[PDB]
Amino acid sequence: GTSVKPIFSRDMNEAKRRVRELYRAWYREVPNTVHLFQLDISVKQGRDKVREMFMKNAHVTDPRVVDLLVIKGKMELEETINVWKQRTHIMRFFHETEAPRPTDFLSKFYVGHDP
Amino acid sequence: ELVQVLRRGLQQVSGHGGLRGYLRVLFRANDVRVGTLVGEDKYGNKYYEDNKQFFGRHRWVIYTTEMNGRDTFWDVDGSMVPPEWHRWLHCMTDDPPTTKPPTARKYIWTNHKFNVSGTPQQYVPYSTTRKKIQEWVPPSTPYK
Amino acid sequence: SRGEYVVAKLDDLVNWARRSSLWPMTFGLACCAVEMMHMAAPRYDMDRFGVVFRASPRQSDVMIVAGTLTNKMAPALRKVYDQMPEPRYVVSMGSCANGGGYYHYSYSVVRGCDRIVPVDIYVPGCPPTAEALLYGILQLQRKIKREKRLRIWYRR
Amino acid sequence: GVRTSPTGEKVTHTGQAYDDGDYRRVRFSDRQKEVNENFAIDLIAEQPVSEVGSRVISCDGGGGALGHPRVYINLDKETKTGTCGYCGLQFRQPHH
Amino acid sequence: ASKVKQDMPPPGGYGPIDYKRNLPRRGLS
Amino acid sequence: TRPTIRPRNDVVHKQLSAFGQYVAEILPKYVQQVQVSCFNELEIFIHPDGVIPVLTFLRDHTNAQFKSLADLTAVDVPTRQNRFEIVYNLLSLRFNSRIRVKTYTDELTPIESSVTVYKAANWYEREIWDMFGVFFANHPDLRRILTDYGFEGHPFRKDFPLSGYVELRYDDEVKRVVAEPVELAQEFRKFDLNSPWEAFPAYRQPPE
Amino acid sequence: SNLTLNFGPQHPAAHGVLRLVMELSGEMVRKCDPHIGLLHRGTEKLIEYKTYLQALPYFDRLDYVSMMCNEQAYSLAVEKLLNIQPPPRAQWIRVLFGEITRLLNHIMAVTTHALDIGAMTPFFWMFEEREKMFEFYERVSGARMHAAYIRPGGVHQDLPLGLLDDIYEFSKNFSFRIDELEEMLTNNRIWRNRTVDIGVVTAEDALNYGFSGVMLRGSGIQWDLRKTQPYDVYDQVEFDVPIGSRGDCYDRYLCRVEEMRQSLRIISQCLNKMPPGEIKVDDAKVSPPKRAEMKTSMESLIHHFKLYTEGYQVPPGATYTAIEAPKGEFGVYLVSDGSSRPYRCKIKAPGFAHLAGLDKMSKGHMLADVVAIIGTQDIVFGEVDR
Amino acid sequence: TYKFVNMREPSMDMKSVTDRAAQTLLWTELVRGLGMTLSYLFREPATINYPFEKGPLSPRFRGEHALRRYPSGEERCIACKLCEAVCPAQAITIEAEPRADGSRRTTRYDIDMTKCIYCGFCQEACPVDAIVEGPNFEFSTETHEELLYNKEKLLNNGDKWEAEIAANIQADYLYR
Amino acid sequence: QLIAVDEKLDITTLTGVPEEHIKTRKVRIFVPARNNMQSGVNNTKKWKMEFDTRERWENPLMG
Amino acid sequence: LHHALIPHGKGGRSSVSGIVATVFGATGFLGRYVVNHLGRMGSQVIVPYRCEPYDTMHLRPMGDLGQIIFMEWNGKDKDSIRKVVEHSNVVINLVGREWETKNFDFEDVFVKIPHAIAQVSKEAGVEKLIHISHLNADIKSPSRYLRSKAVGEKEVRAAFPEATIIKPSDIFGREDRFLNYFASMRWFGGVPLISLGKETVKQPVYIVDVSKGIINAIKDPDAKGKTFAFVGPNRYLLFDLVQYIFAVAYRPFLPYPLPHFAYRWVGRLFEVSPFEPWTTRDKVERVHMSDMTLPHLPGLEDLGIQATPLELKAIEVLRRHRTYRWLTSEMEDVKPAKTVNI
């Protein structure tokens, strides 16, 4: 029951199919992105980052949430392909000027009060 | 006629105190008009009017060549005008400070300062409040 | 020394030429640009100081940031700043450009354009009047007059 | 009422002067420190106390609408003077 | 007992203001 | 009651009430509520499934003729199970009138795009999607319109912080503009202004 | 492949921070994609964190060429929600300054349109007049453009003791300046070639796309909000509404010039009909009292304190208030939850719909024609992005 | 009530046709435009000789902020914080404590001039005319830090501009 | 058409909040106490959600 | 720690790191990166400059409001050094010129100035001093640059016993002369190399690695009196290195041997330029001298830095040196050069 209306997919199988299609499109786009934006990363780095972004949301079990995630990923792909994005936008995925924040207890205790 | 305009030009060069004063005003303000001296400044600026000029060109100041410490023969700016002549010059009032002096207070600056930005006299912001948390001072004597 | 006198005179000549021909990029972001227009309007006539607008960043000496700089716009401002040949100057005009102003606490506003580019003159106001912007421009000319590139080269 | 700290820095009306080991003093080197020289606490301490022949006096700071809101000051205590909470002027009844 | 003084139009009215387009003919045949 | 109080208009109030009754009778399938505000502003609450029929009827009916869409926006009310309130404002030139149509949705439920009914909606629906995250089905070209490229989240939502999560600055080492977690030199100072005494008795709620 | 071109934001013809992505075959425009948001400042969220008086200066900065018209729309919305009424003298002042503001906006629009086209001269002639009107703004409020004079209770201050005379002196010379502008532009064959039959929009399309103002009237639609849904004292003034015939850029230019003339007419009427009285609603729980009262009376001081710290509370409810701003219908959807802060403020700007229709209006045109169309839509991106 | 801007039909008589042919071939309206520009060439320009000549201003003009005093030299500000509450830009920062003589005075009074929108709401809100927007507008700085005003800077502005500020207030306070 | 989703509602991956501000945060849901300086009770009618207090420090400039 | 100097915040732009640093030589190649890394964390940075203030403009956006303070200084003046190090707990020295000017020889910039800085900062109570010398610093080296570096290193150690001395080797980056010098040679036609560059081994180090190493050495309590050597992860023969540089730039590589005396004569001819020389005799000696191996000194991995290989960052320096034809070529297309490691 729970009486919900879908966006595109009726169960997780169709949602997974759409996820795979979007992943294929991003995988094909990465080399062109590296060429056009004149990025100093490799194609391997770009595809690894695409996989990491996809795996960030691997725990989702709602087909509607997956449909919205695919819609957002398609929005980002359309944005990248048309060059609406600049090199700064593409490089924002890699956080190159962010100092690594530690995760163990002792370093956090040393730096400050935040957990 | 044209000849009367030329005569106006010659009386304009004659009216600035000779050829060298004419050249001084031309190279100092890029203007050679003659107006009635409304007044002078305690810093040397002179203030003139000419009510026959259109609104905007009917009041002007010939700045001093020597402000507080700096040479202002070429380097002048609008911040050198003191507040009373500032009120008259920007047409906030019709009455000059000579005929309508401002009210006297003992905390008002007796010496106007110009824009001191980019100069060792510039303003540097800082916190004006005192310390909030006081730390414990350990005793100066050994504990054993 | 004769060499020091020569470099001082050449220094003065180059500074005079540079400050007497200040070409700002035709570039406006928001409300402040309107007052910029009023500085070119007949009453103030910036052209009489040798100050003429030119659209191309390659033919520009000064960038006037006249308006809010949002996050979406910051890369473009940085890009057209980088395409200015040197020497180049930036005049920050208005509260928005100076520090964010009315939109300082926004998710989409850069809190001051000096985070993106180096700024020479900060013109306060919201908007600054055309006269205040003219005062800032004349202030930039004085700043340029104080340059001594050739003297520093000679002493080094 | 200006006065310098042992470091040579002027002390403001607020009383804040950077400590000897405070690095922030570096912001004044090659520049100056803005200090207003007319201390209000000292200037208001010079005004003469006004003597009035009534128990309750009124103060509006002078200038009518150019002063502060008008307040009424009781003057029954003879060990002290009635002080305006807006302007700082002092009032008393003729005593002794 | 001062009377109310306020920015108002003068008694009667302000002089008429032209607003219609005025483009003369100004030519030969 | 005369000089400083806004005057009333009962004729327009009656006309709007009658027309609201008209609309409700014609479309019982979707119309849930009809209201006439005190300053004569007709409001019609409907079911989401009736977005396209209602608007179509309202713009096409001979007695309606609301051929112009003033604006379309959304309101976020987190306490409601359906978070978002979709508001359409329509103007009729033939009858010199205005009408407001309201519906509801939540984060995961699409609304039918009304570009077919009104061409003006395109950018309005894009803006609602960008600011609130409400998806519109069958929209020609749905994408962000106001926010920066790659911006995460929806700013107009009540939960989103006023200054967001990231800021921008130019970094010389990478020679480009970078996005970093927001740090503020001075924190925005939250004021508590609400008076502890009730202002308007006419709106008092039952004590539950 | 079509050439893909960035038009702006750093472009003279852009008229602000617009990134017009254009697909072109030769110089023919195959597609227009306006990318906006380069001046989105998040104004509506900010307005949510302010009181109703603190949110007023935002409406100055929405459309920076029609400041008081933006203020008036917001003030009307808040007054409708408060169930109060501004005094008659305030309403006459509001209409007078709204017409002065319409003059300012129309000068800016027409001269910047001519400047894009290439006729650079009329700009300098008309900006001196704009300067004098800025002086009028400044005398009344102390600010040249962002005045913040119109408040939800009326106006902030009464006119200074000689302002009407100077407004009269300015108004009796302006028609000749309009005449000189028309001599420059109206009958020039080059201007007509650059404007006639460019950006033609039908009445049906203009209505459906959400157009308003001149973009309607150039296509023959007879609609002016001052006539159909009057506000303040607009029902007491007489003026004609210009109407076009062809729906092109040329017809929109003629409409704006005639609108300028009709604004002169309305100003003349407002000057001769200004009544006496107070300038804000005589209700100290909404409008602040005078300073002498604030310094003499206990109630006046309490109300001054509370109005400037917490602000007045607005009874719960939502309104959509629209005015005939110089660029079209300008609206506010204002939602009050009963407190002194607005719960929601959606701003409707005509430029949003006009720019959304720019792609439609540019079908079958060249690059220069697209520049002319952007000029003829009268776009300011403060109101578009907000 | 409406008029038409482009609904006029041209006459088709031989004289009108010949006049239009002369307009087309001999470029009469272009000479009209040339005449208009030539006319403007011989007018007096509306330019002013800045900085020697200034633009007109008003007593209500909003400029650089200043903190004022009573004629005794005592500060007017009592730290009510109404200016800080009303400021739409949150540009004002205030800290206060009892003075050594028990007076209610500020210990911190900052205005961030790059946050300020120069609206004048603070001088309206001030109940003792302590904070004002003075007449000055020529205070461009070379660094951002110089535009972060503390209490010393604002008191110095008041001391420097009091003569003109009092005269401006005297000319406008009856409209307030 | 209805699809009968069975799982608990979860929108974290769509909100765009950084994960640090999702996992390490604690909210308080409460009816605020009446301000003891006043007798009005109108500020004690609705429920409030607010986040945990984090570090605040002193700006080196201006404090 | 003097409460005002207690770290606060999340280590960002508006935070307080507790560092107050005076960076001599901040207007150079390494100085901009050092100031950027210091201002990222919210440090107070004092920049002494003798150049035209225009030339410091690029350092303005590196800090928050008030966090970067610019002060005029003179290298021959010790009162000026006192003025600029009075309130700092860290002093970094990056002063150095590749060529010798009329008013400053190598011994002035590498012995006198570093010694004066060390003496004055020790007198002023500065807690930490970081000095930069070269990896190849030596008392009897053929280059007077390196002889002066070694003498100045000893002088600094004598004047500030707890100073951290860092010895990098051929920093490469966007504004680095070493990467640029090879690129510059293409205009002439042929690349002149002594012995065809087959008898020289280089171990270049990335600029960001050196800046991070300096920053970490500041925050390291046990790095006080240590001496570090900052070298890259790979060693190349000069021939292979220049060949890789020319392959990344997509320029035709035409190497030819040039005898030592001819190259010295060319350097002397280029030395008479009143402006910045294209090359000098000292530069010729330093280019064809193999990088030393110092396994007994702590390295970047002792400061927590993982050295960046040149293969990963060469394109960001050399894409500017390409023609339009090869401007979009990807990074992994150039077949990394041959390393002579052990």
Ligand SMILES: CCCCCCCCCCCCCCCCC[C@@H](O)O[C@H](CO[C@H](O)CCCCCCCCCCCCCCC)COP(=O)(O)OCC[N+](C)(C)C
């Ligand atoms: C073969 C020659 C080749 C080179 C030729 C170059 C062109 C010829 C030289 C032209 C010189 C003209 C510039 C000097 C004009 C000075 C004007 C004067 O007003 O400047 C003052 C300052 O003068 C400058 O400091 C010095 C100017 C001259 C500098 C030295 C010139 C030496 C020339 C040597 C030429 C050598 C050429 C070698 C290569 C050929 C300050 O004025 P300023 O404050 O702005 O005014 C603001 C406006 N106010 C006044 C109304 C407020």
Ligand SMILES: NC(=O)C1=CN([C@@H]2O[C@H](COP(=O)(O)OP(=O)(O)OC[C@H]3O[C@@H](n4cnc5c(N)ncnc54)[C@H](OP(=O)(O)O)[C@@H]3O)[C@@H](O)[C@H]2O)C=CC1
């Ligand atoms: N490959 C490399 O770059 C590595 C560099 N070396 C050492 O590392 C340090 C930094 O190197 P790098 O940044 O590349 O060199 P740069 O030439 O780029 O910068 C040198 C700095 O020192 C200043 N300076 C130079 N001479 C003087 C002087 N006589 N008086 C005052 N200041 C002066 C410069 O100021 P100004 O611009 O005004 O002249 C400048 O800021 C230097 O000590 C260098 O010797 C270590 C191994 C190699």
Ligand SMILES: C=C(C)[C@H]1Cc2c(ccc3c2O[C@@H]2COc4cc(OC)c(OC)cc4[C@@H]2C3=O)O1
């Ligand atoms: C060149 C002269 C004589 C004037 C005209 C002018 C400037 C400077 C800048 C600009 C400009 O006009 C163009 C086109 O019209 C607007 C309209 C704008 O809003 C009304 C706006 O705000 C950013 C910007 C612009 C352009 C702009 O940047 O000086």
Ligand code: SF4
């Ligand atoms: S500073 Fe004020 S006038 Fe200038 S762009 Fe910002 S809001 Fe508009």
Ligand code: SF4
């Ligand atoms: S003028 Fe307005 S923005 Fe500026 S300090 Fe006063 S209230 Fe705040």
Ligand code: SF4
């Ligand atoms: S300046 Fe005026 S409003 Fe502000 S705290 Fe002082 S007395 Fe109160």
Ligand SMILES: [Zn+2]
């Ligand atoms: Zn008193």
